[PDB]
Amino acid sequence: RLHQGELQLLAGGVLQAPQPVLVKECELVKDVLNVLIGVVSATFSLCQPAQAFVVKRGVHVSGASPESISSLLSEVAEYGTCYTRLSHFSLQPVLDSLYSKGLVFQAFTSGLRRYLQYYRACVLSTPPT
Amino acid sequence: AGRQSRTFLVDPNLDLSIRELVHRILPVAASYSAVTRFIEEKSSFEYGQVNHALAAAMRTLVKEHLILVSQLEQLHRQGLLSLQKLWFYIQPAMRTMDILASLATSVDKGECLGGSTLSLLHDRSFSYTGDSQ
Amino acid sequence: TLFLESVQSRLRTPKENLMKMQSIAESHLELDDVHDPLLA
Amino acid sequence: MASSSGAGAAAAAAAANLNAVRETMDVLLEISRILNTGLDMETLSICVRLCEQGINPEALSSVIKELRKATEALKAAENMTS
Amino acid sequence: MATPDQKSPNVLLQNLCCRILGRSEADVAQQFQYAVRVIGSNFAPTVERDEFLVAEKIKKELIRQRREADAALFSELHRKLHSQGVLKNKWSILYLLLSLSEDPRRQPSKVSSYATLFAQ
Q1: How close B57 gets to chain A, by Cα (Å)?
Q2: Membrane-crossing residues (chain D)?
Q3: Which segments within D1-82 are labelled E, that is strand?
Q4: How far apart are CA B105 and CA B58, in angstroms?
Q5: Closest CA to D67 of D77, D75, D79, D78
Q6: How buried is residue C11: exposed, middle or buried, by Cβ count under 10 Å (0-12/13-18/19+)?
Q7: Cα B18 off chain centre by
Q8: Which residues pair with A44 in a beta bridge?
Q9: Using only C-alpha atoms, what is the Rg of chain A?
């Protein structure tokens, strides 16, 4: 906090640093698990066109700098974005009469659904501790 | 509305992840309701012996599905079901119910009855070349 | 290595992962989803 | 759905500008150290903010010298009283 | 967009005095008054208002102090600062830094305790 105040003093008020919101980690883990399922959380919001979690500006974690924590959370949000977007791409479900990708593609998407099921199983296997 | 899958309204104050899981599972419940309705209606003698027998087999499978659903309810009562575990367990049920609803909707759109119902079942079996179940 | 071993001796001086994955799947995968062994 | 993606990029650009400012401030601190100015991180930041406000360097230098003499007398009194 | 409450130069000077003295604002009131008197006094324009000229003067002064390496480092840092373009008044900051430079070779003339007599 002292260093951020010093940086703001040096920046002469021009760098409106987003206010560091201190959140308990025992919550950050929940947000991470939601990201692993592509779910937006209080700190990470889902950008629908990108199917991507967006970190809330000014996330502060105890014991770490809010900027470094934000960087870590940005990487985790990128991973969650990849998971959710890949799920959506693979989520093309039914070989309806409008399905033009053929049976080989449909079987590929079935295998991908199996893979994503295994991924979900792994995510659920992740202990929240 | 018609021979369509049932749509559901979810309480807006639910957790977004819970609401999305509910909306993902509800398609299975709607398909199950449609298949059970088709089985119970077309099992009447007026639908002909072929359509009646198909509906009866669907009704038996719906009974097995209800048994499965009751077992899932029991698992929920034990607290051993997580949202990801719930989603995984309903995924096979979701796909089976979706196949059953697609067959029901194909019979209904074709108004398939008796031998026509057998034609619709054959055409659905050819349509399920990629779906062994 | 031979020197160190001889010096210490004279001075008296000083599939399983697949099974684990199967158990994890059984604990976390739905009964009906076939495990893909390459994916597993 | 598109709009949500833009705010992240805008925030990243603002953070990059802030990081560049921080780097510049660190460079200025290093220069002051090389110049043996005697400013600490808090004092250096205050000096930077004051300089941004237009203070005359001759007046600032005289004020700094007088403040340093007063601070030295106060520090000697504080060290004598402890 | 509420540009961070950059407290007026008097408040900033008071905070600076408190930081330098290591005392609370209430303990530096006489020093604050002295600062206000100094700041209100007309100061002559700085000898050089050119960033590059100021950097060259700093390098020359460091060379006069036999700090040629420090002169080169100063010239490099000045080039970097000019290229960064974050500071609006490069000439003023350079003049301040030049005024605040201290010669490590000149043994500090230990300020006789007598200077405190005028501080009151």
Answers
A1: 24
A2: none
A3: none
A4: 13
A5: D75
A6: exposed
A7: 22
A8: A55
A9: 19
C-alpha distances out from residue B132 to A100, B25, B96, Å: 21, 22, 11
Q: Using the beta-carbon criterion (under 8 Å), do E41 and D59 form an inter-chain contact? A: yes
Strand partners of residue A23: A61
Taking the C-alpha atoms of B95, B96, B101 and B106 in order, what is their torsion angle to the nearest 10 degrees?
A: 100
Interaxial angle between packed helices E51-64 and E90-100, expressed in degrees from 0 to 180 and rounded to the nearest 10: 20
What is the CB neighbour count within 10 angstroms for residue A69?
22
Judge whether B21 and B127 are in contact, CB under 8 Å: no
Nearest CA-CA distance, residue A19 and chain D, Å: 13
- Chain B segment 51-110 residues within 8 A of A by beta carbon are 82, 84-85, 87-88, 91, 98, 102
List, in order, residues 6 or more apart from B107 with CB less than 8 Å away.
B38, B42, B51, B54, B117, B120, B121
Angle between helices D41-52 and D3-34 (to 10 degrees): 110
CB contact residues (below 8 A), chain D span 48-67, against chain A = 48-49, 52
Identify which of A37, A129, A20, A113 has the alpha carbon closest to the alpha carbon of residue A80.
A37
Resolution (A): 4.7
Q: Which residues contact C26 (CB under 8 A, 6 or more apart)?
A: none
- Contact between A13 and E1 using a beta-carbon 8 Å cutoff: no
User: In this complex, does chain B touch chain D, defined as having at least 3 beta-carbon pairs under 8 Å apart?
Assistant: no
Q: Which residue of C has its CA nearest to B83?
A: C28
3-state secondary structure string, B38-92? HHHHHCCHHHHHHHHHHHHHHHHHHHHHHHHHHHHHHHHHCCCCCHHHHHHHHHH
Lookup: tokens for D24: 């510049």
Structure tokens at A39: 């779910």
Share of chain B residues as helix, strand and coil, in percent rounded to the nearest 5:
75, 0, 25
> What residues of A are in contact with residue D7 (Cβ under 8 Å)?
54
Q: Residues 6 or more apart from A57 whose CB is under 8 A from it?
A: A18, A70, D11
Phi, psi of E2 (to 5 degrees): -70, 80
Question: What is the C-alpha separation between E35 and D64, in angstroms, rounded?
Answer: 9
- Backbone phi, psi, residue E82, to 5°: -65, -40
Partner residues linked to B39 by β-bridges: none
* C-beta of residue B42 within 8 angstroms of C-beta of residue B103: no
E91-109: burial string, b at 16+ Cβ within 10 Å, e else: bbbbbbbbbbbeeeeeeee
